[PDB]
Amino acid sequence: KVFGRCELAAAMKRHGLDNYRGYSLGNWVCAAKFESNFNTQATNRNTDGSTDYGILQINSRWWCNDGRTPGSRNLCNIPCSALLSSDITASVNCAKKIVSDGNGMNAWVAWRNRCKGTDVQAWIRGCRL
Ligand SMILES: [Cl-]
Ligand code: NA
Ligand code: NA
């Protein structure tokens, strides 16, 4: 599924990401745009041989099982393929564990490099939330 900006903002708000661990909704929407282009089916190989899955590009090195990432964990106890569904529940549940783990949203490279230290509220302008 390819979400619209305001359509995904609404989905994320309904799943409890607005202000989760202090990260306003725009942070999550900005992260999702640059991670997945709002595409639930996005997959991208990392240099380390891990892959990032879905709307929030959750990494197989630590969070999900894709059966081809040596020495990896599955801390969200989910197959990585379950993070590609049109329903964002599983990705949000996993993202809440990631962002709770001490480093906050710095876990997301695109958030650190493209959203952090920017006006992220722009990402939810015009949206019915
Ligand atoms: Cl934080
Ligand atoms: Na893994
Ligand atoms: Na613009």
UniProtKB/Swiss-Prot annotation:
The active site is at E35, D52. Its EC number is 3.2.1.17. This is Lysozyme C. Belongs to the glycosyl hydrolase 22 family. Keywords: Allergen, Antimicrobial, Bacteriolytic enzyme, Disulfide bond, Glycosidase, Hydrolase, Secreted, Signal. One of its GO terms (molecular function) is lysozyme activity. Disulfide bonds join C6-C127, C30-C115, C64-C80, C76-C94. Substrate binds at D101. Lysozyme C is capable of both hydrolysis and transglycosylation; it also shows a slight esterase activity. It acts rapidly on both peptide-substituted and unsubstituted peptidoglycan, and slowly on chitin oligosaccharides. Residues 1-129 form the C-type lysozyme domain. Lysozymes have primarily a bacteriolytic function; those in tissues and body fluids are associated with the monocyte-macrophage system and enhance the activity of immunoagents. Has bacteriolytic activity against M.luteus. The gene is LYZ. In the egg white and polymorphonuclear leukocytes. It is found in: Secreted. It is an enzyme of class 3 (hydrolase). It comes from Gallus gallus (Chicken). It catalyses: Hydrolysis of (1->4)-beta-linkages between N-acetylmuramic acid and N-acetyl-D-glucosamine residues in a peptidoglycan and between N-acetyl-D-glucosamine residues in chitodextrins. PROSITE patterns: GLYCOSYL_HYDROL_F22_1, GLYCOSYL_HYDROL_F22_2. GO terms for biological process: cell wall macromolecule catabolic process; defense response to bacterium; defense response to Gram-negative bacterium; defense response to Gram-positive bacterium; killing of cells of another organism. GO terms for cellular component: cytoplasm; endoplasmic reticulum; extracellular space. Monomer.
